[PDB]
Ligand binder design. Structure first.
Ligand SMILES: [Mg+2]
Ligand SMILES: [Mg+2]
Ligand SMILES: [Mg+2]
Ligand SMILES: [Mg+2]
Ligand SMILES: [Mg+2]
Ligand SMILES: [Mg+2]
Ligand SMILES: [Mg+2]
Ligand SMILES: [Mg+2]
Ligand SMILES: [Mg+2]
Ligand SMILES: [Mg+2]
Ligand SMILES: [Mg+2]
Ligand SMILES: [Mg+2]
Ligand SMILES: [Mg+2]
Ligand SMILES: [Mg+2]
Ligand SMILES: [Mg+2]
Ligand SMILES: [Mg+2]
Ligand SMILES: [Mg+2]
Ligand SMILES: [Mg+2]
Ligand SMILES: [Mg+2]
Ligand SMILES: [Mg+2]
Ligand SMILES: [Mg+2]
Ligand SMILES: [Mg+2]
Ligand SMILES: [Mg+2]
Ligand SMILES: [Mg+2]
Ligand SMILES: [Mg+2]
Ligand SMILES: [Mg+2]
Ligand SMILES: [Mg+2]
Ligand SMILES: [Mg+2]
Lengths: 102, 99, 63, 70, 46
RNA sequence: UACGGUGCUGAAGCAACAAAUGCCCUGCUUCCAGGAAAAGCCUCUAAGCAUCAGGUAACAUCAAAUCGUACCCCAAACCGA
RNA sequence: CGAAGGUGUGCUGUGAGGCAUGCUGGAGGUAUCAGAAGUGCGAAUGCUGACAUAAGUAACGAUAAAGCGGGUGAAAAGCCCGCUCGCCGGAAGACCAAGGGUUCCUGUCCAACGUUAAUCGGGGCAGGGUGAGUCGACCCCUAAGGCGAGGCCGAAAGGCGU
RNA sequence: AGGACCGAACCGACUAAUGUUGAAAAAUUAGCGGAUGACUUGUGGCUGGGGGUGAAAGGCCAAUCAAACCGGGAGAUAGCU
RNA sequence: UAAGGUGAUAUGAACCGUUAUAACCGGCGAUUUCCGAAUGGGGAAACCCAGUGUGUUUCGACACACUAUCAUUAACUGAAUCCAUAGGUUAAUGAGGCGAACCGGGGGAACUGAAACAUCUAAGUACCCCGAGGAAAAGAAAUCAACCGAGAUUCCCCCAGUAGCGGCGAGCGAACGGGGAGCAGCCCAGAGCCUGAAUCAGUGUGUGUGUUAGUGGAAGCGUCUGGAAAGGCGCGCGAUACAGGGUGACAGCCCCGUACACAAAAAUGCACAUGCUGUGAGCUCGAUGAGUAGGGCGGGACACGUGGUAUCCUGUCUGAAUAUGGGGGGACCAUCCUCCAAGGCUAAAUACUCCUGACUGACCGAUAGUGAACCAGUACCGUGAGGGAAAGGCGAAAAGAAC
């Protein structure tokens, strides 16, 4: 149920955000889903062999997995996944309404 | 039929400890830890041949282990082996040691 | 060899990554991890490679 | 103990004092052993009596054949 | 005093230890009563 | 000197007497209850060998593999929770 | 705009109980009517868990008792150093087998374990540590006894044994 | 010489005290009997439950014995509590 | 099949991958140390030791392969004795061990009940032991019925808790006949005519399906509350799908799916259709199951406890007819009717569940439900067989608390 390749200007149907686009993603089957949609703050203790404290805490691999609408030249939504003939066949790689790739 | 001998990989890295190097002061006898089924005779050639050392006679041991990493229940053994080779003062190795 | 690249001649010669092609692994064999300089790629790609070539033998020879 | 021909042995039955008891019993048959084949040499065998006759009835030799295919 | 047990690891297996088990009729069963029937990780020694 | 110990150096180093349940002693004496076995070892030949191989001795050399070896052990490491 | 469960209050019924509601709680709960039941415990020297009581009581394991000065440390009667003192010495010493299976040595740490304190330990976590042609086991040999080709027996299992 | 005598080790348990939620599920303390013998002990082996072993007490057969322990028939049966 | 990956506690590191060849899933294959039937001898399982070969050999020697017992056959040998057996060697074949229930066979308790207890009961049960299969077993009348007839075995309903058996106590307990599930019948006991067509066993292949990965698959907004919307309100759309689960609360339209339609290099279950091999078929004339049938004695099985007891079986002693002969028709006799024993084979309905997939439950929800939701048959306890626990929850997400 992976819905991203190298970049997916997603939205945020729910999750403290309205529709903040993003990247990274990395959604999959056994792994996570991280995008600027969310981020937080609290650094972790660093005893000093070396100051293993670069410092600065914000998002790392913030939550929010699948269930996220991807980019569309217009508004939002537009669930992808349709399927086309030939054109690789390594994946349906199409789009709802009219479009395929961004 | 060719002898299934690990002509090369019979041993592995050297042990290394307090006895290490201080043992070298004795007769340039270094340790190195070989695999279980070693047989000194298989070690002799192992070190001299290919690794250019020209040693003579060994020792070899065994040794086990046993610990407990996580909280409760989790424990084991581990085994291992020892070796000491020798290396006559004559045939050296242009020793691969330093500080 | 690599993959299909492996199917060619019949000499066990290629099957010598152990001799003078393995001594390299021997050095970086000291635990306590000593040797962090840069691209310290001391992962076993060669031992996994010993098979394949260890295979094919029969492919041509017997089964 | 199995009688080579017309094979038989230790069947079990019970006793009867008519009054009280049904203690289990056990049978057996008959040991004994003779025979000597007039077609080669005296091969013998341990057989029951009612087992000897039978053979000696019209076998005696026409019966070793089954032991062939023991 | 002398508790009822004492040691000896060489006198035990000659009573229990699959050679002592498998050698006996019902004995081979003892391993099945555990291994097969049950699920004992390992049970047969001193 | 780290306080545990270390490197160097280093005298005399014999006689007399006294003992054992240890050794000569798998002995000697004696007794009745009359006191394992098999291999090594020595030797004798069989079949076989039949200028050979083997045998004995001297020395020269190679080989002697593999496991165990830490510590407790009349006890705080074993049998008694 | 707070379900269940938990804890108070008021009203209500003949009663087993019902309702409303304040507080806690963080998700579900079920008028009515009908239906199926693991349907209601104080007792069974009842099962399981938790907590009392006695009570800060007895006891701290041989009556071979220990004193002092330093050191370390948050703290020393107990640990390290030192001088005394006492105890064992056919042993309370030393070595090995049996059995145990890292308890050995070094560094560390003191929660739990040490019948107290613990900087100390056979405790925790790390490392290190047992080197053989002559010692032992393998290995030749056989004892008691075991197993046992074929074999003799025996409903089967199996017993005996060259 | 001796199932001889006094007596340690070793083997055993006649007496008293203590212990009796013990140091201890049979011991400690002071005495006590045997101590070249039907002695005593290490290692391993052989006898299996109605069976073994027994210088005999129904004693011993793993803190269990007028019929061991474990699993089963089993939710035995219980006019009793 | 793919945009992501090198299982988990397990991150870190070093890497592998990305508009046609990482990783993952499925098929086939390769490798598969050692112990274990264990199989070269041995053996306190994971180890000790050996014989015959082999290559390399830096030519020292070492690593690997085979050498268990037993049976069928064959080949070679070869005693007491002329031969001849016995016995030895070899080779190929197969067997051995392990298993959940169900199945057949050998052996076979007591508690308990009878308010005691010996007949009897529990019960052919528990247990032990042998053996085989996806099923076993059974099975084509020497059956039953009554003078009409039915028609192998098997299982279900009923006859009936009846007839009957029984210290006629306890208790045991049918069948005839009737309704159903499901249905096939054939071989040898032997010689010709024809002659490889029926039909069986196993292989070959070809279609069609089943399975062992998969592909696609619909349709949401705005606003209010809120930390979070699926929730309240308003306006829409899909529907052969509104099963279910997930998603910071309760979502048909966000995610996975869902109906529905499609899919296989290969590997195979199974159908058919026929090739090959083995098999035999159809018909004329023949035969037509003896230590057996019966019987004495002793036991057992029949619902049936020897009874007035038929029928079946056999340890022991006997012993017939061969077809107008023989068996049965519940002591026995006559008559009548019925059926041919002493050879064998056979699918289905029937039994079970170690295990695989799908799907369900007025089934439990953490001293409940499996002993075990969790690194449980673990820790522990015992010499041993054997016994055998406890133990789930932060949160929406670690934001697990820099300082
Ligand atoms: Mg030592
Ligand atoms: Mg005690
Ligand atoms: Mg009480
Ligand atoms: Mg006090
Ligand atoms: Mg008081
Ligand atoms: Mg007081
Ligand atoms: Mg006091
Ligand atoms: Mg004390
Ligand atoms: Mg330790
Ligand atoms: Mg110490
Ligand atoms: Mg320690
Ligand atoms: Mg050694
Ligand atoms: Mg024997
Ligand atoms: Mg005397
Ligand atoms: Mg005394
Ligand atoms: Mg005396
Ligand atoms: Mg003994
Ligand atoms: Mg006792
Ligand atoms: Mg019992
Ligand atoms: Mg019963
Ligand atoms: Mg009871
Ligand atoms: Mg073997
Ligand atoms: Mg063997
Ligand atoms: Mg009674
Ligand atoms: Mg899909
Ligand atoms: Mg008629
Ligand atoms: Mg439970
Ligand atoms: Mg709870």
């Amino acid at each position: 149920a992976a819905k991203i390749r190298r970049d997916d200007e997603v939205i945020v149907l729910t999750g403290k955000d309205k529709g903040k686009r993003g990247k990274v993603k990395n959604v999959l089957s056994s792994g996570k889903v991280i995008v600027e949609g969310i981020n937080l703050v609290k650094k972790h203790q660093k005893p000093v062999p070396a100051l293993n404290q670069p410092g600065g805490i914000v998002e790392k691999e913030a939550a929010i997995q699948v269930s996220n609408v991807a980019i569309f030249n217009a508004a939002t939504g537009k669930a992808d996944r349709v399927g086309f003939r030939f054109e690789d066949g390594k994946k349906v790689r199409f789009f709802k309404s009219n479009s395929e790739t961004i | 039929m060719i002898r299934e001998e690990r002509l090369l990989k019979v041993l592995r890295a050297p042990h290394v400890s307090e006895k290490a190097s201080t043992a070298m002061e004795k007769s340039n006898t270094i340790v190195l830890k070989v695999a279980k089924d070693a047989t000194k005779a298989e070690i002799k050639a192992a070190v001299q041949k290919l690794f250019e050392v020209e040693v003579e006679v060994v020792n070899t041991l065994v040794v086990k282990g046993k610990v407990k990493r996580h909280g409760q229940r989790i424990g084991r053994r581990s085994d291992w082996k020892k070796a000491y080779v020798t290396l006559k003062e004559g045939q050296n190795l242009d020793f691969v040691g330093g500080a | 060899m690599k993959a299909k690249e492996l199917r060619e001649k019949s000499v066990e010669e290629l099957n010598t990554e152990l001799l003078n092609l393995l001594r390299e692994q021997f050095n970086l064999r000291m635990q306590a991890a000593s040797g962090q300089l840069q691209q310290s790629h001391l992962l076993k790609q060669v031992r996994r490679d010993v098979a394949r070539v260890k295979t094919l033998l029969n492919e041509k020879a017997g089964a | 103990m199995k009688k080579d021909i017309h094979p038989k042995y230790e069947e079990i039955t019970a006793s009867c004092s008519c009054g009280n008891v049904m203690k289990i019993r056990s049978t057996v048959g008959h040991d004994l052993n003779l025979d000597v084949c007039s077609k080669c040499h005296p091969f013998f065998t341990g057989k029951q009596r009612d087992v000897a006759t039978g053979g000696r009835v019209d076998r005696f030799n026409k019966r070793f054949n089954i032991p062939g295919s023991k | 005093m002398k508790r009822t047990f004492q040691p000896s690891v060489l006198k035990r297996n000659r009573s229990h230890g699959f050679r002592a088990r498998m050698a006996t009729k019902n004995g081979r069963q003892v391993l099945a009563r555990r291994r097969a029937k049950g699920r004992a990780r390992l049970t047969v020694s001193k």
